[PDB]
Amino acid sequence: PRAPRTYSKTYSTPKRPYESSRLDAELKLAGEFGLKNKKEIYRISFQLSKIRRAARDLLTRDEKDPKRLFEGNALIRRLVRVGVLSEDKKKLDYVLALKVEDFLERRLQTQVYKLGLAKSVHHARVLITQRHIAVGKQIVNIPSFMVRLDSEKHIDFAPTSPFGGARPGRVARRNAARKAEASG
Amino acid sequence: KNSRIAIVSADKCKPKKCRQECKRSCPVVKTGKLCIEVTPTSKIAFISEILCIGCGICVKKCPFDAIQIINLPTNLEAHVTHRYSANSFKLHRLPTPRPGQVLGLVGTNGIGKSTALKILAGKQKPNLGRFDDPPEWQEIIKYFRGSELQNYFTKMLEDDIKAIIKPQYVDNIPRAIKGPVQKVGELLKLRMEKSPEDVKRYIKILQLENVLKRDIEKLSGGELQRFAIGMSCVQEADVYMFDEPSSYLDVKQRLNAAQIIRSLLAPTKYVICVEHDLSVLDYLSDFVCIIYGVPSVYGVVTLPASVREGINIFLDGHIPAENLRFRTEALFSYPSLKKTQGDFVLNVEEGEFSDSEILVMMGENGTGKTTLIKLLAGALKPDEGQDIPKLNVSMKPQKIAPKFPGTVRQLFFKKIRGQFLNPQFQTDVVKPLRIDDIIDQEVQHLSGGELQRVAIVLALGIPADIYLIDEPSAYLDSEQRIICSKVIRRFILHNKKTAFIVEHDFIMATYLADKVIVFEGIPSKNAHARAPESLLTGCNRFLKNLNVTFRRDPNSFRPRINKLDSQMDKEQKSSGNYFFLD
Amino acid sequence: KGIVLEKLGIESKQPNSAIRKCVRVQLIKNGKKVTAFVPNDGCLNFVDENDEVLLAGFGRKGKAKGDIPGVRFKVVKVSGVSLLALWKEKKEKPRS
Amino acid sequence: ARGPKKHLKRLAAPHHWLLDKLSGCYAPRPSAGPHKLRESLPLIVFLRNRLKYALNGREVKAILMQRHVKVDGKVRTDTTYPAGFMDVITLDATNENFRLVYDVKGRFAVHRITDEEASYKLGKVKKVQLGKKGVPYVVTHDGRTIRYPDPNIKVNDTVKIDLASGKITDFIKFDAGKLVYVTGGRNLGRIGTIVHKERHDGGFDLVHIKDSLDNTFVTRLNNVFVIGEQGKPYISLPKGKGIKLSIAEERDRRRAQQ
RNA sequence: UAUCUGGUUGAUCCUGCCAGUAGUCAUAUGCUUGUCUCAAAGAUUAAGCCAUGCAUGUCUAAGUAUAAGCAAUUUAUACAGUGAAACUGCGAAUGGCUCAUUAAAUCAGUUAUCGUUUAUUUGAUAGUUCCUUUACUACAUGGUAUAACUGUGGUAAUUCU
RNA sequence: AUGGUAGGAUAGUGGCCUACCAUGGUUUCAACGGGUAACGGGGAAUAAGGGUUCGAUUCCGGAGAGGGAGCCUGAGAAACGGCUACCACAUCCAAGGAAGGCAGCAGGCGCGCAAAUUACCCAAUCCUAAUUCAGGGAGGUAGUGACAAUAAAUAACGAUACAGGGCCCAUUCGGGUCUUGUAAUUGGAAUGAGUACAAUGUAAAUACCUUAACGAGGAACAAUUGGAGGGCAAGUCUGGUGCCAGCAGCCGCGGUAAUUCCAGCUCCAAUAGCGUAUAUUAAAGUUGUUGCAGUUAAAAAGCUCGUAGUUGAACUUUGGGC
RNA sequence: ACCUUACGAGAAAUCAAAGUCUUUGGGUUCUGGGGGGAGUAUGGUCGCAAGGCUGAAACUUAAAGGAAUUGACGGAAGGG
RNA sequence: GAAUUUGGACAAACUUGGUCAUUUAGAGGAACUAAAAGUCGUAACAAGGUUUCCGUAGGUGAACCUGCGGAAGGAUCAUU
Numbered sequence A: 001p002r003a004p005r006t007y008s009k010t011y012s013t014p015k016r017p018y019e020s021s022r023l024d025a026e027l028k029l030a031g032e033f034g035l036k037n038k039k040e041i042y043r044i045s046f047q048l049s050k051i052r053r054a055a056r057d058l059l060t061r062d063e064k065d066p067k068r069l070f071e072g073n074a075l076i077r078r079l080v081r082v083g084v085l086s087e088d089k090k091k092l093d094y095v096l097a098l099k100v101e102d103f104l105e106r107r108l109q110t111q112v113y114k115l116g117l118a119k120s121v122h123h124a125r126v127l128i129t130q131r132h133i134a135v136g137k138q139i140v141n142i143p144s145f146m147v148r149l150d151s152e153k154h155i156d157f158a159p160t161s162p163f164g165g166a167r168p169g170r171v172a173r174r175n176a177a178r179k180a181e182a183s184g
Numbered sequence B: 001k002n003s004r005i006a007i008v009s010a011d012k013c014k015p016k017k018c019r020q021e022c023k024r025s026c027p028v029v030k031t032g033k034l035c036i037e038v039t040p041t042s043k044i045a046f047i048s049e050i051l052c053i054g055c056g057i058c059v060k061k062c063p064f065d066a067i068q069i070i071n072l073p074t075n076l077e078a079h080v081t082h083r084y085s086a087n088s089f090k091l092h093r094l095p096t097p098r099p100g101q102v103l104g105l106v107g108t109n110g111i112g113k114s115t116a117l118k119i120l121a122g123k124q125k126p127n128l129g130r131f132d133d134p135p136e137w138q139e140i141i142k143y144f145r146g147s148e149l150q151n152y153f154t155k156m157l158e159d160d161i162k163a164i165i166k167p168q169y170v171d172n173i174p175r176a177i178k179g180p181v182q183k184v185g186e187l188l189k190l191r192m193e194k195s196p197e198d199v200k201r202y203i204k205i206l207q208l209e210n211v212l213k214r215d216i217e218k219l220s221g222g223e224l225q226r227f228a229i230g231m232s233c234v235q236e237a238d239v240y241m242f243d244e245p246s247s248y249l250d251v252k253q254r255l256n257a258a259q260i261i262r263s264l265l266a267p268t269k270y271v272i273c274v275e276h277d278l279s280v281l282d283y284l285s286d287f288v289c290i291i292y293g294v295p296s297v298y299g300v301v302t303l304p305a306s307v308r309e310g311i312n313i314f315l316d317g318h319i320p321a322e323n324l325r326f327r328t329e330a331l332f333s334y335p336s337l338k339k340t341q342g343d344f345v346l347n348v349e350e351g352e353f354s355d356s357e358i359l360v361m362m363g364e365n366g367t368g369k370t371t372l373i374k375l376l377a378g379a380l381k382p383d384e385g386q387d388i389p390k391l392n393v394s395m396k397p398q399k400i401a402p403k404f405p406g407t408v409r410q411l412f413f414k415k416i417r418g419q420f421l422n423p424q425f426q427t428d429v430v431k432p433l434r435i436d437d438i439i440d441q442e443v444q445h446l447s448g449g450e451l452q453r454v455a456i457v458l459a460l461g462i463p464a465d466i467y468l469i470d471e472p473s474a475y476l477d478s479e480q481r482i483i484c485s486k487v488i489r490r491f492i493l494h495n496k497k498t499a500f501i502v503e504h505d506f507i508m509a510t511y512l513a514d515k516v517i518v519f520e521g522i523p524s525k526n527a528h529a530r531a532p533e534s535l536l537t538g539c540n541r542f543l544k545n546l547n548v549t550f551r552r553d554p555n556s557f558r559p560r561i562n563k564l565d566s567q568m569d570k571e572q573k574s575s576g577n578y579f580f581l582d
Numbered sequence C: 001k002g003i004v005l006e007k008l009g010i011e012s013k014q015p016n017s018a019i020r021k022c023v024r025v026q027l028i029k030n031g032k033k034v035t036a037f038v039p040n041d042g043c044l045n046f047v048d049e050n051d052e053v054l055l056a057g058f059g060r061k062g063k064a065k066g067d068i069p070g071v072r073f074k075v076v077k078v079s080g081v082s083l084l085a086l087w088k089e090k091k092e093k094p095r096s
Numbered sequence D: 001a002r003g004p005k006k007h008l009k010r011l012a013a014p015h016h017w018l019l020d021k022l023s024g025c026y027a028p029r030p031s032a033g034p035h036k037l038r039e040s041l042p043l044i045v046f047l048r049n050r051l052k053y054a055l056n057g058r059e060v061k062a063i064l065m066q067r068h069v070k071v072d073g074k075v076r077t078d079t080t081y082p083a084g085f086m087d088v089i090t091l092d093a094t095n096e097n098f099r100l101v102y103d104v105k106g107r108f109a110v111h112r113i114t115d116e117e118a119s120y121k122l123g124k125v126k127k128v129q130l131g132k133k134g135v136p137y138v139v140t141h142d143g144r145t146i147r148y149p150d151p152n153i154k155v156n157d158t159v160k161i162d163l164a165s166g167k168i169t170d171f172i173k174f175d176a177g178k179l180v181y182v183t184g185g186r187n188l189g190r191i192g193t194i195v196h197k198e199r200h201d202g203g204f205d206l207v208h209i210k211d212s213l214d215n216t217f218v219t220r221l222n223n224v225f226v227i228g229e230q231g232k233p234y235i236s237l238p239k240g241k242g243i244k245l246s247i248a249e250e251r252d253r254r255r256a257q258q
Numbered sequence E: 001u002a003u004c005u006g007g008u009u010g011a012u013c014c015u016g017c018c019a020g021u022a023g024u025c026a027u028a029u030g031c032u033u034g035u036c037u038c039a040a041a042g043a044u045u046a047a048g049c050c051a052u053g054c055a056u057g058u059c060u061a062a063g064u065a066u067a068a069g070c071a072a073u074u075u076a077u078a079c080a081g082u083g084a085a086a087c088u089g090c091g092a093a094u095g096g097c098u099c100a101u102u103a104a105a106u107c108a109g110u111u112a113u114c115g116u117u118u119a120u121u122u123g124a125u126a127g128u129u130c131c132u133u134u135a136c137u138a139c140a141u142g143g144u145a146u147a148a149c150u151g152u153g154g155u156a157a158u159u160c161u
Numbered sequence F: 001a002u003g004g005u006a007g008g009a010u011a012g013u014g015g016c017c018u019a020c021c022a023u024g025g026u027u028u029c030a031a032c033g034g035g036u037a038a039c040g041g042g043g044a045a046u047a048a049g050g051g052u053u054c055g056a057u058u059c060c061g062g063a064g065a066g067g068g069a070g071c072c073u074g075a076g077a078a079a080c081g082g083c084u085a086c087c088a089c090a091u092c093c094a095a096g097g098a099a100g101g102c103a104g105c106a107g108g109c110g111c112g113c114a115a116a117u118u119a120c121c122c123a124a125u126c127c128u129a130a131u132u133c134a135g136g137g138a139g140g141u142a143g144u145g146a147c148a149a150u151a152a153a154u155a156a157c158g159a160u161a162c163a164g165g166g167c168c169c170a171u172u173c174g175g176g177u178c179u180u181g182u183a184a185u186u187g188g189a190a191u192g193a194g195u196a197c198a199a200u201g202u203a204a205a206u207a208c209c210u211u212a213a214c215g216a217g218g219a220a221c222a223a224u225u226g227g228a229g230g231g232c233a234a235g236u237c238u239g240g241u242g243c244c245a246g247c248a249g250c251c252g253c254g255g256u257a258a259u260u261c262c263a264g265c266u267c268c269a270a271u272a273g274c275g276u277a278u279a280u281u282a283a284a285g286u287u288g289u290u291g292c293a294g295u296u297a298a299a300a301a302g303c304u305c306g307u308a309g310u311u312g313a314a315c316u317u318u319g320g321g322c
Numbered sequence G: 001a002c003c004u005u006a007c008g009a010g011a012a013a014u015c016a017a018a019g020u021c022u023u024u025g026g027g028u029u030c031u032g033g034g035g036g037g038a039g040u041a042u043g044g045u046c047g048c049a050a051g052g053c054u055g056a057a058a059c060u061u062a063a064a065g066g067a068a069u070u071g072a073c074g075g076a077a078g079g080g
Numbered sequence H: 001g002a003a004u005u006u007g008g009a010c011a012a013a014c015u016u017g018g019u020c021a022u023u024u025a026g027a028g029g030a031a032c033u034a035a036a037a038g039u040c041g042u043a044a045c046a047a048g049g050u051u052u053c054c055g056u057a058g059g060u061g062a063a064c065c066u067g068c069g070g071a072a073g074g075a076u077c078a079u080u
């Protein structure tokens, strides 16, 4: 037989199912960021837990330690590159103080809304999903895309779409067909 | 989803020592019912067939492995291949064609054996049980995914396969001709589709020599069948079907009929046939496929087997591959002295046609058996008188022909209602036969096989002076032959009448023979009849005239042909004793 | 899986006044006799006789569940059809 | 059981071949040859996975049967012939000459060498004894037997082998101050001068070794291959020269050239 | 991601269990089911029983060819191209499946053969034999078979012969 | 049985076996026996730390080919897609005889709470052979597949009618800019699910990726599964039944006013998934080495001696100077 | 042995040990792990016997229990 | 050099016992649990109307009673 495919699970449900504070918190997050279920919030809190566990394992190590220097610089670099971690706060103690809204501001949905091509997070979601968006010269239809802060300058409409031009679309071409039918 | 029943074996059930653990265990016995009746003095435990749910608890709770769960046939509402119509016959499986090889279909008539061949040929595209909205080929093939039939059916759409069926109805084919009228030969000539010399000469093998020149309509059923085979054999086709080839053929022809079909076989070619006679199937088929099910209701095709194991399962009635029992275990003076046409002299020779004691009258294919029976009925007179008009005949034609819009039960009124006494009279004889089913149906679209059975009952009705049943073997299954022979037997003791039966089979003949009119003579050229010789003597003469020997099976008394040059066959010619159980 | 032997009217413990509508079943693999409680309202009218039922525990890890004295199993399917599908009239039984 | 094995599953193949874990259940099992199957490189993985001159094993066979590649001067049209340490590989079309030397990461390198250098190879002597009729011989690390050797050649020395004849050109002894190649173990690929060797009668003589950046390490004597005196080696060393930069210095060097 | 909560009392604080709560490359089952990628899958009970078909064969310039095989020549009246069968040579001891047995046994890491077998691969390596040694002879080359084939057959039947 | 000396046998060492001799060898630090629903390991799940449970199963080693035993050939087998016998099943038969071994790949019966196609191919990965060429149910490819795992549709936006703040006003209940949400009020835009030329894909296809043509909007292309006393999110409801029917993991609810049953409405939780059964882990400091408890809640043997086990006072070179 | 404190401990009654125990490690032995079934069956072993010592499970159950509090009662003691 | 044949080691199996590890039937007992508006008393809880409990022995319709030694978990922390 062939080598097994590795897979892993990307979220984790919380321990107490029904607690009113956490429910109202996650509904505020879902409404402000335009999310469809609690699995997205669980995905981000899982990713943040993994980052915090690695940083917790490095801060127990003393300073000048080669593992701590190497992997702390790499983790800090990946966080400042994706834009979750600010340029001044680069000291592996700010890494611990991160929270899920820092990750949620960097999704392509909220970035399309903040750049102003959208007018809503929900409009941004459907604009992404229906393929009118291109982060480089390449279409992305995944709302959780986590743009890398030199890609923020290049989020724009897709060339092979309306709103980036050169052919209108199904319902517009139908309505034009009816009006040209009535003219002749 | 088949119904499951617990059977108890007579071997290794010993109630005196068993403490009746089967009986205590049974849930149905606990609810009150006597599902298992067993006491310590008893010979054998009894398990009720209809009061067993087949849980299998009894099987685990026996000191001995005396109990065993088997299946039973049932309607399945799954894996359906074809429905003709709403509340019509249902075909569940489909036999898988094997290349290079003969694949035989065995079952009761009306089970869908003919339905299978049409489906495989492409004549009847399956609907998968959707009569209302038949699926197209794209959907049929995707149903067949994961099977050899998918690739086989894909080829048929691409015209990679040519498939020809040999029709099971001999009677239909004379009606429809290429032209208004034609003799036998010119039909063959245009569709030879094979060089005569280079391939083996089927016409010499299929004994068609004289009958190349007769017009097709004059031919009897016996001759006609060998013509039907000839039309399929001349074709160049990838797949070859043969429906009921044994019918209207005598013992020597049947062996030759086995010989011709196998000669077709090639690595590319496919050959699949539905044959009812067990004995010919030994030399006909590599593999045997059992079909089963209640007749005209449903039919299920099973896994193939090799012939030796396949035939023995069919006689046993219990397929071991699928753990079911399908329950079919087989177990006065009138000296006419001439008749001619000028071409075929059936010189008769004197007979003391006996009193009230059934007689066979047995010939060969061109030997003109019907002429005698036409002459016992007054017809086809001798030229130079000496024609006795004494006898009154209830005959039944070989070529039974429907001319009337008749429902069966009304045809029961029209001729055969009579007095219809309950004991030992026409009511009693009907009960074994399934004629109670067919009363509703129209005779015109009553099946050919069933039409034979209705004619057999129809002819027996009027006592007259002498009913003469002509050729009652065709279009019957194996089991139906056993029933029909006994039903003739029981009736014909009760009437003090006689019958001249015109069989082309042998095994029914031997069961229904007290004295034997033999028909030595060249077939299809001037014959000579003889006297009604006694049973042991009369089979043996005909058996001498063909160089065929029959052996009596030790276990089941089934009559099996011998090899043409073999130790038993050599021994029985030397001893002079071509047959047994005389 | 088991085979239904009879239908029982076991009355509940104190204080509770009810008839609990269980069945006796003989297990198919063991031959052992077992009492199983047919769960919902009116569902004893499916579980009539000699049937193949499927049984599960109640969740109490081998203990008798409630006011019901001495049953440890519940019925899940009867004749290959699940009892809630029969109860919500999603499906319906075969004849036998 | 019951006899020798003929297959080799992927995930059981040596890790330094760098065969990806998908694309097949099997790996090319090296046939019996001059090298042990773990410390070897079959010609299929060298021609396909390292030089990209083929896309299939079928194309590697098509290359081999027209006698293009030859290894140590002999043609070798075998798909899983074990090419090992210090073997020369000649591709006469493109007139290319490789030597199998390790990079410091522990894997076989694509070390292109010149045409003068392809005329020889080094071998570490594994045993010196007297064969029949009193003729002495040496056995090098790739199993070559060389008769009538110099009497000064004892074990763990390196002899320079001519590869047109099987003769010995010269030889490097074993003492302090000798340039060594580590072939085996954790330190596989490193080059350093030997400082001293530890007797350890009864098994597994150790040897202490320091590279050009004065980093010491120690290795069993089984994994050490002397390649010359300090300064000049007797072969051309690959890029990197067996230095073993740490991962910190390695990403610093990668951020220089990027 | 170092968290608990409900139930003994008229109320209280405890012991203490039951119950909840979260997960499961843990199975099964119910209800429901649009899309993309990826994927386990007759282990558990019965290492219970098997209809059918397939899963082990193999040829190079380079062992043997008079196929009464097929080809076209023009080297070649001994053969010489392609190529069935058959003999010879290798392979069939690898792979795949399963987990019954097995508790210092297997196994794992670590040793040993200065206590042994090893087809193959790779590298080395064999002037000595005219066995009575002036011929008793063939060494510019010695003897039998036997298969396939051809023909005659046996058995109900077999990859029988 | 433990050892000694000789031999025999083996590829070789050895009580491996034989002849003679001696009386040894293991064990409370658990031998020997019994049980295992026990193939071992890499590993898996769940864990603050320590742990607990599992590992038939993608790799490594072992063993087996219905059960036993014996052997031929060969470098290599105690070989089973080799042979021989017995035991157990079981096929054909002309009764003389013959042939068997799916814990290979498909498939069938049986068993059960439990698991897929008697399909295509050597194109890739590799293996074998006289060999680049032939072969390979090894292996790959598609089928079935809610076992797990990843991403992620089921709508987005206006214009007008309806429920809101200071202020431009300093023009008392007047437009309400600047928003926030309801609407038996209307508009165009947008797109895939699906269908399908084509090309790509592939050994050939299917599908994915791409793409003409078609494909939307409220009875359309309509998301479920469990719940609403507490634990534990969510009813100051409305009909029905009346200790019945039923619910309820636990406490409990139900005898005319049921926050709990049976329903309608509304609401909540997770969501292409959710519920149940069984097992296991955390919770469990309810197994406690970390880290429990023993007067009365469960539990200090009636008392002392005592072998193994575990545990046992202090002391020996320190300071100084470069 | 007793009296008084409460450093402290404990669920409390109470305790100079029942303290020096989440700031958890001086040495060592024995016993317990919800209530029944049950100190019961069964097998050993000692005993003349009576019995002793070892010692379960199926099944069943949502409490059984400890120390205090406030009432109610007492064929308990006092007072008004 | 084939059939056949002598001894040997290996040894499947077979027949007659005999042990143990596993099931069934089973006259009868013999308990325990749950649920049960039963029968007779009232042993314990108050000095429960003879303080209660322990071990042991005997007796009795049933709780239980009685002898001997012990305990306070007593109804007495108390007579310089």
Ligand SMILES: Nc1ncnc2c1ncn2[C@@H]1O[C@H](COP(=O)(O)OP(=O)(O)O)[C@@H](O)[C@H]1O
Pocket (backbone or CB within 6 Å): B084, B085, B088, B089, B107, B108, B109, B110, B111, B112, B113, B114, B115, B295, B296, B447
């Ligand atoms: N063409 C048809 N249309 C409808 N029903 C049919 C047709 N053919 C047969 N049937 C019914 O279904 C059964 C099919 O079996 P049939 O075709 O006769 O094969 P068999 O010869 O094995 O009976 C028949 O018994 C008949 O009752």
Ligand code: SF4
Pocket (backbone or CB within 6 Å): B008, B012, B013, B014, B015, B017, B018, B019, B020, B021, B022, B023, B038, B044, B045, B061, B062, B063, B064, B066, B067
């Ligand atoms: S197996 Fe049947 S016949 Fe035999 S003892 Fe049991 S019940 Fe009686």
Ligand code: SF4
Pocket (backbone or CB within 6 Å): B005, B006, B025, B026, B027, B028, B029, B035, B036, B047, B051, B052, B053, B054, B055, B056, B057, B058, B059
């Ligand atoms: S199968 Fe079940 S019902 Fe039928 S006889 Fe056996 S125990 Fe009775």
Ligand SMILES: [Mg+2]
Pocket (backbone or CB within 6 Å): B113, B114, B115, B168, B243
């Ligand atoms: Mg028919």
Ligand SMILES: [Mg+2]
Pocket (backbone or CB within 6 Å): C014
């Ligand atoms: Mg209660």
Ligand SMILES: [Mg+2]
Pocket (backbone or CB within 6 Å): D028, D029, D030, D031, D080
């Ligand atoms: Mg190889």
Ligand SMILES: [Mg+2]
Pocket (backbone or CB within 6 Å): E008
């Ligand atoms: Mg209490």
Ligand SMILES: [Mg+2]
Pocket (backbone or CB within 6 Å): E009
């Ligand atoms: Mg209370």
Ligand SMILES: [Mg+2]
Pocket (backbone or CB within 6 Å): none
């Ligand atoms: Mg719990």
Ligand SMILES: [Mg+2]
Pocket (backbone or CB within 6 Å): D001
């Ligand atoms: Mg193997």
Ligand SMILES: [Mg+2]
Pocket (backbone or CB within 6 Å): none
């Ligand atoms: Mg060599």
Ligand SMILES: [Mg+2]
Pocket (backbone or CB within 6 Å): none
């Ligand atoms: Mg010795």
Ligand SMILES: [Mg+2]
Pocket (backbone or CB within 6 Å): none
């Ligand atoms: Mg010895």
Ligand SMILES: [Mg+2]
Pocket (backbone or CB within 6 Å): F038
């Ligand atoms: Mg086991």
Ligand SMILES: [Mg+2]
Pocket (backbone or CB within 6 Å): F056
């Ligand atoms: Mg197992």
Ligand SMILES: [Mg+2]
Pocket (backbone or CB within 6 Å): none
């Ligand atoms: Mg393995």
